[PDB]
């Protein structure tokens, strides 16, 4: 809770990577194959 | 409007000497500026006083039309000189505080002034051409401070990269609400939908009689006992606070006032009373502050916003006065971020991608709540708390409520509340108050040379008391405030000098830090209070405090 994608920015500040490097890594985990990021991501887009 | 308004510009070009001279300013050194007074004009010619009711959107059109007659006539190469000519319609009488801020009065050329708060710098197709800028409306007052509606101003590429954030500049202007958004085809302006255009900016009687009673000693005791006359409060807390009511070359310092009490105690409150008093008003209220408060959120933006630079309280109020409160309130990382900002008074970015500079000018006042015990437990303060420990010693001075038990204070308390009611009942220092601004904007003191000496006499003999039994526990940063409390007794006396009685006081509020962390058998050293190569470098360093030996006026040694 809370830690969803509008918010785990802020996260990333602590682990010294700037907004601009987890681009490389934000798009691409839907290529990752992760079960947990697909479900938040795509059925909040349109459905909403 | 009128069609015959042209034939009667046609006349109208057909003393004035010195517009020859001041359009002659500008010249080859391209120092691009010129200077407008309306009243040559309207003096030689009344016609043009008639113009300002009646059309005067279109006299900003044809004042830089018939400027330029001049401009084309002699100098045609100012043309290729940023291509453009500024007026700067000088001010227009009238003068409301209040009264012309109101939608139902445009179409005026305005008067006014504000504080800028917030902006988007960083940033590196009509609308593409100028950027944005927020302004205030409502001054700070004591009527005025109700919370006003934010003005948006809109820089004409005229004043970019010559101001900056905090800036109490002066806005004149007439407000024509050029609303583009109407169309729904862009995004949206706030709710003051006026294209403001920028044309000035600011600086960056009884007081006689006044100066009669600051002679008064009388007087000078009891200003630490008429400030906070609500609760009696304890007489080491308010002298240290007036002295830092006052404010008064590689010139840095740190003033770090804080308080421990409790919420409940109008103390939480004090702080509010203090704006009344001062000339420049801040707003902490915690969450949802001025602007951004400290707070750091992200959501889905706009059609059309860019990011925004982080204005801490100290930018708010540059150089003005700033209060925080609710100090649990606060978000930790921003903490971290002006920790330093507030120690160097300035903002440093090392990104290497966004450069930028604020200035920080206010006294920092803020009261902290205890987590749960003082020092109840046996180990020491900071060692109790999972944050982190340097941080927390960075405060020069803790001052702490002292006492719980004091029936004597639960007498005199008791009356207020009776007070309570009796003034609210149905019934049928305002002169101190310009005290203070008088002698800190008219009076500035310059630097003695033969005075310096003396005042750093005694500062050698606190040292020596930690000198006898100990090895050097003491270090100069905290005297280094002490040089500025002193400075603040002239004020208050005005002998220009600082007698031994004024420093034992002071004195004993340094100590009180000491009290706090040292077992209280330390109390009986204010007895004594009462009474009173490589080696090579050292010695020279504590007599002179330079680096270099040869510093005594070396641009006339050498040369002559």
Known sequence: ?48 | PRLEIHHRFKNFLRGHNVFKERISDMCKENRESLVVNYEDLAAREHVLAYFLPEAPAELLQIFDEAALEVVLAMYPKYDRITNHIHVRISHLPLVEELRSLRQLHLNQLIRTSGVVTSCTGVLPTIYQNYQRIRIQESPGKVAAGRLPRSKDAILLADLVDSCKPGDEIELTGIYHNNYDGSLNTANGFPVFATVILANHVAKKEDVKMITSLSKDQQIGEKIFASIAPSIYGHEDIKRGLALALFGGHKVRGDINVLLCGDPGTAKSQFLKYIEKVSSRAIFTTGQGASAVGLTAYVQRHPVSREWTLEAGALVLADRGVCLIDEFDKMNDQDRTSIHEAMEQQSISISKAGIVTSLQARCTVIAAANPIGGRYDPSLTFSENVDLTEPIISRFDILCVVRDTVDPVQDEMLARFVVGSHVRHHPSNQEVLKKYIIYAKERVHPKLNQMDQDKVAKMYSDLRKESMATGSIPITVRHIESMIRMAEAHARIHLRDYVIEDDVNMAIRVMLESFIDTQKFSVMRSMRKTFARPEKDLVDKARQINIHNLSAFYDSELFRM
């Not at chain 1, 994608?5 to 990333?12: L, P, T």
């Not at chain 1, 907004?19 to 991501?41: D, P, S, T, W, Y």
């Open chain 1, 1 to 48: 809770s809370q830690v969803s994608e509008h918010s785990i920015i802020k996260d990333f500040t602590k682990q010294k990577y700037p907004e601009h490097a987890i681009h490389k890594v934000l798009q691409l985990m839907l290529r990752r194959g992760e079960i947990q990021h697909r479900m938040q991501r795509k059925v909040l887009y349109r459905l909403k």
